[PDB]
Structures are given as C-alpha cells and as structure tokens.
C-alpha cells in the first residue's frame, strides 16, 4: 500500500526538524490538489490562510515551543464553524452564511498547535449515511468511487483513506462516526455522550448546537491519534487506560441483532476479530442473561432520534409530544443505561459490527423509507440497519470503529468495539491491542 | 470534633475501633439530636455490624481513605433498606432496595452510614420540616431555620454529630443550609456527580436540568476528599497553591434582591483579605451576564422543571419545542459565563441575602416576608443570589464567614468555572487561611 505520516509522527517531524510546518501544510495540500478529484471530500478550502498559520507554527517550533499537534495540517467536518469560513449543512439556503467564531473543538486543536485548511463534505442536514448536497457535490469512496463514501462525516473519512490529511473531528448522532470510518475504512471514536463540547457545531444563522444523543468524536488513520484528539478535545481529561494487554479481558460477541441483519463477511469478520483475542487470552462470550433488549432498544431509540431531530414539532394536524412525555422518555433512557451498566459489570467490551453490510452504491433517494439494501445478494430495509448502532448512542457508551478488513469486493469491514461510559481511552486501547492480534 | 480524614487517621492508628467510632457517634447524636431533630431516620443496628466489618478489614490491612468512618446522608439518597419519603406522608413507607450511587462509592470507601437527616416536603422549601419527623432546629439558635432541603445534614455537621454529609441542590440546597448553619458545602458543576439513586419516591426519576449533588462537611479537606469519591469521572486537581495573583469579582449587589448589612461587610472582609495575600479585586465587569435576565430565565425553567412540564388544567403547558429554546437560552448564559471567567478566576457573593431567619408556618413564599436590617424584603427575590451558579452550572462554594449580631452564621459563595469544582474548594481553603491573621 502507499502510507502518510500519522497526526503524531508529522508533529515528531516538524519537532524533530527532518521538515517544517510549512512543508507539511503544502504537502498536504498538494495531495487535496491532486486527489480530491475524483473524491471530493475536501469542500471547502482556506490554503492561504493556513499557509500563514503554519509560519506562524514554524515560528513557534524555531521559539523551543513544542505543543502536541504543532504545525500538523487537518481539516475538520462541514457543520463545525471555523471563522472566517462557511457553515452550510449541506443547504443551498445556507451557503453563504459565514462563521465570526471558532468552534470550541477547533479551538482546542488550535491551541495544541494544528493548522486547519479546510473542511470536509457532508449530506443535507446531516441526516444520511452519504455525504451528497448541492451546495458542494458527492464524495466518493477511495476504495470505489461507485460506492457512498458517506455517513455524515464521510467528507472527513474519504480524505483520511485518501491520505490527504492525517486527523479529522466529525459529530454522531446515528453513526456519523463509526459508519463513514466504516465504509471507508479508518479510524472513528464515538464519544461518551456529554464528554466533548458541542459549542459550534451550530445549526446555521443559529446557536443550537446541543442535542440529546448527539456526540462529537475525532476520526484519524491510527489509535494513538484518535488517544491524543481526545485529550486534546475533551471537557475535562478523560481516566487513561491501564489495560496492558488482551490477557482476561471479557467480550460479548454479537453477529446478530434482532431487527436488522449483517453480511457473512461481516460476520465472518467479526468472528475472526474475536477469534484473535481468544489466542491472546481473552475470553468471549457469545450471550448473556444481562444484554438488554435490543428491540425494545431501537423503538425507544428511534421515537427519540425522531423528536430531537424535528425539535419536538409535528406535522400538520399530528398532536406533538407534549413536554412530560419527553421528561418520561429521557427516564426511559435512564434505565437502559443503567442496563448497560449491569452488563458492563461482567464484560469489559462488546464486539459487533458498525453495519450489517460494507458501502452501499450512490442513492438519490434522500428519504430512507424509500430505500433498500444488498445484504449476501438479497434485498433487505435500509433503516433497519440503525439498530447496528442504537446501543453506543442511546446508552451513551462510547464506540470505536477499527478497520478489520476487506470483503469479496475490497469493500472495507470495520469492527465496534462498545465500553462502557466513560471508559473512552479502554475503546482505543482496545482497538489497539485487536489490530496487533490480528497482526499475529 | 474529629472531621472525616482526622476520624479514618484516628481509626488506622489505633486512637478507636471502627466498633468505638461508630458507638462513639451514637453517643452524640442521642445526647444532642434531641433539640436539634437533624438525624431523623436511624439505622444504628446495622450500622454497628458494619463498624465491625470495617474492623475486619483494619485487621486484615485494608485501608481506604472512609475505613470505619460514620456518618449521614440526606433522606433523599437511597440506601438499601432505609425508607426514602422526601418528606411526603404518602411515601413514608417507601423502602428502597438498593444504595444510591453516591452512597455506593462512599460506601465502597469504607464509610459507614448510620442513617439520614431531615428535609422539607418535597425537597421545596428552604427549611427542614415535614409531618413524617418533625422540624429541624438551627444549632446555633433553636428558634431560626436550620437550613433548605439539606438542613438537618447541615445541622448535624454544625452540632458535631457527624463528619461528613451529602446533598442535593437545585435553588440552593447545599449552598443554603451551609450558610445557615456555618458548615461547608459545596454545589458542585452541572452533570459532573450521578444523581443516580435521588430519586422521587416509588420512581427511578433522579435527572433533572439545573439539580446537582454535593458534599457537606467541616473542613475543605473532607470535601475534596468527598468529590474525588463520589464523581463520575476523576475532576482536575487544582493548581493554585496561594492567593496571590488571583483574580476575584466581588459581587454585594444584584439587581432583583438586595442583603443586609452584616451579609456585606463580611463578603467585603473575605475580599479585602485576599487583596492582602496578593489578589487583585474587582467590583465590576463588562463581561457580567444581565443578572435581571438570568434570575427570570432560571425561575422559568425551575418551575418548569418541578412542575414535571404540567400545566393546571386551563393552562396550556410549554410545549416541547419551546423547551429546547429553552435549553439554547441557557447554553447562552453558559457561554457568557465562560467570557467572564477569561477575566476572573472566581466570583465572591453572599450566598443569601440575609442569615438563617425564624420558622414560617406559611407554605406559599408569596405570603413570606425577610427581616433585612428592620426592613422588609420579598422572600422569595433572595433565589437571585443562587440562580447565577444554577443556571450557568458552575460549581459554588459556600464555606463559613462569621457570623451577624446575634450570633447567626453568615458564609461566602465562590463561584468559580465550570468543572473546576477543585478550585472552589482550594480557594475556599485558602480564604480561611487568609482569614486567621
Ligand atoms: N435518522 C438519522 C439521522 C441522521 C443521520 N446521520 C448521522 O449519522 O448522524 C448525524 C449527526 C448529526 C449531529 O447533530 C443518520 C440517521
Ligand atoms: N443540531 C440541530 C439539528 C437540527 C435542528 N433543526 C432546526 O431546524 O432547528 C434550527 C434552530 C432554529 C432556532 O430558531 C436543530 C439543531
Ligand atoms: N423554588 C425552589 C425549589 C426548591 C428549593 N430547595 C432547594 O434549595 O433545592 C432543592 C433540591 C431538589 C433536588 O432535586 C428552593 C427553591
């Protein structure tokens, strides 16, 4: 294969002086320049602005300055602000709204010394597994251009497996994290929910940035980088892990969900994944007494999706949820957490997959109701698959998503790997120790 | 009296058995509850057989930093087999079947829970009375209030009874009865404690915007100690190793309340004795939010979120829509407190506006009047001295002053940035430094 240097080792090289800030900031440049093409991912662009910034970093690392991500060019997802640059959601209406502050994750970045030359593609209102909208065009899949690259912060994992940028930050709130970094095959942390500011990630013309469920989570090539974002990003400094290796480590197995269904490569997949940690001395289980119902779980998940999404409106004559249904509804989350956290008492992660299949061919059907899938050659529902991810987003858990493998048409397999909350930094370590044993 | 650290160091080294130190605080609250009606649900049978417990696991060379240690909890914290009514006839017999998660983790740490300390009906007054136990009495003066919603923990800090205590609080509730009573407590920042086990009687509902729990105590020690035990997640250490450079914002003034004399000059006393250890003080700020606004924005959502989003029949409650603007409106106030404390590393204000005042018969706050310097003032305006660490979700602290003219206690408020709940803690310790000259 053809490598770039991680977010980390381009900050050992600018420290080190084997090459500066601007010479990683017109490299990465030149590299958008030159594949973005027939991707499209890096949308919009602030190259001359950031050519100063990484001066700017230069002079900093001439000053003995070292910071953790000095001089290391990124880009960040659409629907973060980022002055100076547009924040559109994929709208034509938006286009031309332009952000006057920083967001508070951009900001934090920033402070640690990365420089931001750009951001990366998105659907309409981030509410598809693509990243299409007339505002910018279609991002395309590295790995086959034929297929959806997307999930929301597809823009973000297509110039990661493009190789165009080192790190990226997008948000979730039903796996626009762990489904772009699936379908193209990278590195995405779901974050424990309520663990990194929103502030932001505005809605356009607006300050709502807040939701339930919703999370915002780095995506990277490598599991140290997506540590280093982490602690770089979060409100307050999340407990490091102190798993030393696989050894004991306790996995629930799931290849089955009672309201969706999944490739037998991705099955296969999955098994093999666990497989690997059983020859490293874990143990997996493939039930428990304590999993809470998965299909009670989706249900209550998606009639909350549904209400944050529409902000508690109803259409025309439909009677809304009124303000206690919802008090109730949160309650009801409440329990499945505390669910979770009898199951987390016995096993120390789940390993299941992102989604029951790999990229789906470019849709140009924006409602998912009208969709189908490709699931072993038959046709399948499309929104179905959500209950591949209602776990991590409705009991908060955060949820890594690792590259496993390829299937039959070198479309990527991705693994989650769920723990409990707030255990963030076991997710990566996790994910760390699974791609070495699988190295083995 | 031996505070939380002093009691588990006195216990490891032998001064007292866990059995003793138990037997020992028994002795205290049945000599001295007696006026004061604070320990109002009592569980010392059990207690004991878990004294002795702690006492295996000293033999045995365990030590964790509560080993044997008693103490009390608010009522309104589960523990497994004790009642849990918030002060409502109905749900007197209400036994809950397992602990709290911050009884769990104090419990995991070796202390040992002798039983709970009274509140008012509902958790909705800021005084501690109820017709399941009786009133609270304020130590200090048997005819004043002890203190709202977590008065009788305050009340039996104040009496020497226990060490350490817990509560709750979303219109001041740690903040108030700390002043009260002259004890320490600190209201600690928004979502960064479980409030898992707090709930309503015969419900698992505990969340709820705007309410926090926190640790009440003697010494700042035992509530630093208290915080790492109890949070979610491990809070950041504080780094401020005196006063000098600080950067203080001395509030006496609001616009919608007013506080007595006593109250000023004590809060005033408190910033001029930072000033003299090398802090620099402010009286005025343009980055300070519109507290006129704020307090209107907090009652609004207080009253929403007590009332459950109920209206009365006629009414037409806030719909759903309304309340996410709502939410907006408050993390726009998040974020004007986040510019200020780029200016100021805390904010000095009294916690009420005037001290603990004599018990009221009258449920409705309407009808309630203030004695502030011979005058009368509106009750319930004082809210406005507690809505700005509520609504913007910074953790305060509410650590002993003096006290006024007839001996009543009087406390500060720090307001410091949110999940720096450390730093109000290590200020709050240094300010009592400061104070000793
Ligand atoms: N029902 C549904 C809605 C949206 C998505 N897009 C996604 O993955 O998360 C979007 C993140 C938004 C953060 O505010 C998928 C399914
Ligand atoms: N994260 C998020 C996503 C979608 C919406 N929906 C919407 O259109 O509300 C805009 C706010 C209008 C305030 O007047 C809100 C927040
Ligand atoms: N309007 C108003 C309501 C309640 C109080 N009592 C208090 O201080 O907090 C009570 C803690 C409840 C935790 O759920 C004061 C004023």
């Known amino acids: 294969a ?13 420290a080190g002086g084997s090459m500066t800030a601007l010479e990683a900031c017109d490299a990465a440049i030149a590299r958008i320049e030159q594949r973005d093409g027939p991707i499209n991912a890096v949308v919009v662009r602030d190259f001359d602005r950031a050519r100063d910034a990484a001066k700017a970093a230069d002079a900093e690392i001439a000053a003995a300055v070292r910071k953790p991500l000095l001089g290391v060019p990124m880009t960040i997802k659409e629907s973060f602000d980022i002055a100076g640059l547009p924040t559109s959601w994929g709208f034509a209406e938006h286009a031309d709204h332009i952000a006057t502050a920083d967001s508070l994750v951009v900001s934090r970045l920033k402070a640690a010394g990365a420089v931001f030359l750009g951001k990366s593609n998105i659907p309409v209102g981030l509410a598809d597994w693509q990243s299409v909208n007339p505002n910018y065009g279609r991002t395309n899949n590295p790995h086959d251009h034929s297929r959806s690259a997307g999930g929301s912060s597809g823009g973000a994992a297509a ?9 990226e930050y997008g948000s979730d709130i039903g796996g626009a994290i762990r489904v772009p970094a699936h379908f193209c095959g990278v590195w995405g942390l779901k974050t424990t929910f309520d663990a990194v500011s929103l502030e932001g990630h505005y809605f356009p013309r607006t300050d709502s940035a807040k939701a339930d469920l919703s999370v915002v989570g780095p995506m990277a090539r490598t599991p140290a980088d997506l540590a280093l974002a982490l602690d770089i990003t979060s409100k307050v400094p999340l407990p490091q892990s102190r798993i ?29 994944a666990a497989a690997a940690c059983e020859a490293s001395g874990a143990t997996v289980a493939t039930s428990s007494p304590d999993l809470p119902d998965l299909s009670a779980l989706v249900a209550d998940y998606t009639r909350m999706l549904l209400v944050v999404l529409a902000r ?22 409440a329990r499945m957490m505390r669910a979770f956290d009898r199951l987390f008492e016995s096993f120390d992660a789940i390993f299941c997959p992102v989604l029951g299949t790999t990229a789906f061919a470019h849709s140009d059907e924006p409602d998912w109701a009208k969709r189908s899938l490709s699931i ?11 209950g591949w991810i209602s776990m991590a987003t409705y009991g908060g858990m955060p949820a890594l998503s690792m590259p496993l493998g390829a299937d039959g048409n070198g479309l990527p397999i991705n693994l989650q790997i769920i723990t409990r909350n707030w255990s963030d930094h076991d997710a990566i370590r996790i994910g760390a ?7 083995r």
């Open 433 to 439: 120790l699974v791609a070495e044993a699988l190295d």
């Open 312 to 333: 508690g409106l109803a259409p025309e004559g439909t009677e809304p949820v009124s303000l206690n249904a919802w008090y109730a509804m949160l309650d009801d989350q």
């Open 244 to 272: 030393a290796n696989l050894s004991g480590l306790r996995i629930l197995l799931l290849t089955a969900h009672p309201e969706t269904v999944a490739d037998s490569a991705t099955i296969s997949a999955v098994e093999r």
């Open 376 to 386: 072993d050659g038959g046709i399948a529902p499309f929104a179905a698959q959500l």
């Open 159 to 167: 110039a990661l497996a493009a190789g165009m940028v080192p790190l």
């Open 2 to 14: 053809m490598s770039e240097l991680s977010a980390i080792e381009t900050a050992a090289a600018i």
